[PDB]
Amino acid sequence: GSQIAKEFESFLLSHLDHYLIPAEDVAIFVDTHNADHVMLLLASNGFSRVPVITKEKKYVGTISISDIMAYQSKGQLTDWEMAQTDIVEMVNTKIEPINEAATLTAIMHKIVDYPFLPVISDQNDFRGIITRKSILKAINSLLHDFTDEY
Amino acid sequence: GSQIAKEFESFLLSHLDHYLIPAEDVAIFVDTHNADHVMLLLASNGFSRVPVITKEKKYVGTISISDIMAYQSKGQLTDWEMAQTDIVEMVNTKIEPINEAATLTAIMHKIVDYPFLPVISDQNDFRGIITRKSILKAINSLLHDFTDEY
């Protein structure tokens, strides 16, 4: 009864960096890379959607193969033309990044609509991502601790 | 302290049907439908991956636009040829469906690797799906109840 409630206080008031997949371990795209090779790398990494950053590691947005395809068809561009265009042009900006100072309660409410959230500093530096898998793993470790009592 | 632990017992020992998105509300494909229109409907529903069922509502597998594209390129098939082929040929069978009698602990451990799980009966009837969003919403309602005390 007692130890159960405090484990939740220590969970709810815990830091965001406990659940973060650091920027080094996040497959990203530099906004100046060509679109044809991005379509190629996305087929090799296997991720449906990845973050887009600048050379200074500043957050721009996210990209998927769908985004690249929508741009090519909307602009009627050829395959060769795409290999001469950078990602900036077709970058998705719909996902609003979360600050690294964000509460875990604030994470819980946002991660219900997003498979992942990109994490930024106050100066728009890319810090990594919060995935639903990371949060789900944290919930499972917590439940693992309450099955110890009864 | 007291009311906290029982809410978790009632959560952990709860039925799967509390978190299920019933079969009626799941966008599916009938295994005999043409592949070209499936590529079309997948662009209208917006789901990255959906279940594939038979006319008798028996579970077959799942489909995505990637699966359709991989089949067309691997078989070198033309656009018109795809409109004359049914989904059965390119159906993904990697996701193992969960029984409707499955424990919520068993759900927790499986939903960490899968955005969704297709739910089946003992006779392979499709019952619906368990999404990560459904589980994440259930965790949030639970945390909402413990913030009431302190």
Ligand SMILES: Nc1ncnc2c1ncn2[C@@H]1O[C@@H]2COP(=O)(O)O[C@H]3[C@@H](O)[C@H](n4cnc5c(N)ncnc54)O[C@@H]3COP(=O)(O)O[C@H]2[C@H]1O
């Ligand atoms: N290489 C792999 N090995 C093992 N399991 C894999 C995997 N690729 C995908 N999955 C599984 O599929 C889920 C959805 O993947 P998706 O690529 O659509 O969606 C992913 C992707 O868009 C992004 N993501 C995850 N890890 C990433 C990373 N290290 N770098 C860049 N983006 C990442 O976050 C979304 C949600 O991720 P999450 O981990 O919660 O959930 C992942 C994970 O459970």
Ligand SMILES: Nc1ncnc2c1ncn2[C@@H]1O[C@@H]2COP(=O)(O)O[C@H]3[C@@H](O)[C@H](n4cnc5c(N)ncnc54)O[C@@H]3COP(=O)(O)O[C@H]2[C@H]1O
């Ligand atoms: N039309 C829409 N309206 C609002 N939010 C939307 C949406 N489409 C996608 N999302 C959001 O994106 C998440 C990942 O979507 P995705 O299409 O890749 O992946 C989905 C899709 O493959 C499947 N799914 C969810 N609901 C479905 C349904 N009613 N019929 C068929 N498949 C469904 O389960 C996966 C995980 O679903 P989940 O709900 O946890 O997570 C969803 C949801 O949070």
